[PDB]
């Protein structure tokens, strides 16, 4: 019931994942982000800025529990926001979240 975790890792090793608020906003603006993942513990300001951007540009977004789990899913210690730049991986992740 946590298949999204290894899948996001697969997407990252396929170089289809970018992380960090600034870089994610860049992918959204370039129409390359097909799914954005943000943590429930993101700062109020960060969550607001990112979700407003996603909604404006019609990019789907989903939230995961913590920055530890999001970071670990892609081999890092912690991440607050990431973007998946491949439609295939995005569609699969959306159905698992
Ligand atoms: K981050």
- For the chain, the domains span 1-97
Rounded Cα distance, 55 and 88, in Å: 20
- Which superfamily is assigned to 1-97 in CATH? Ribosomal protein L30/S12 (3.30.1330.30)
- What residues flank ion ligand 1 with Cβ within 5 A? 19-20, 79-81
Whether residue 45 contacts residue 4, with contact meaning beta carbons closer than 8 Å, is answered with no
Give the up-direction half-sphere exposure of residue 46: CA atoms within 13 A in the CB hemisphere: 18
Rounded Cα distance, 23 and 29, in Å: 10
Task: Provide the 10 A C-beta neighbour count for residue 37.
Answer: 26
Structure resolution, Å: 1.5
Q: Ligand 1 centre from 49 Cα, in Å?
A: 13
Q: Ligand 1 centre from 69 Cα, in Å?
A: 12
Q: Ligand 1 centre from 95 Cα, in Å?
A: 23
Rounded Cα distance, 19 and 22, in Å: 8
Buried b (16+ CB within 10 A) or exposed e, 48-79: eebbebbeeeebbbebbeebebbbbbbeeeeb
Please name the residues in contact with 89: beta carbons below 8 A apart, sequence gap of 6 or more.
7, 8, 10, 11, 14, 16, 34, 35
Whether residue 5 contacts residue 58, with contact meaning beta carbons closer than 8 Å, is answered with no
């Amino acid at each position: 019931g946590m298949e999204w975790f290894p899948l996001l890792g697969l997407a990252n090793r396929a170089r289809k994942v970018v992380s960090g608020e600034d870089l994610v906003i860049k992918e959204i603006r370039n129409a390359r982000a097909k799914l954005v993942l943000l943590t429930e513990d993101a700062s109020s300001n960060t969550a607001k800025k990112v979700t407003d951007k996603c909604n404006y540009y019609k990019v789907p977004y989903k939230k995961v529990e913590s920055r530890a789990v999001l970071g670990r899913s892609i081999g890092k210690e912690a991440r607050v926001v990431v973007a998946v730049t491949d439609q295939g991986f995005a569609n699969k992740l959306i159905s698992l979240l």
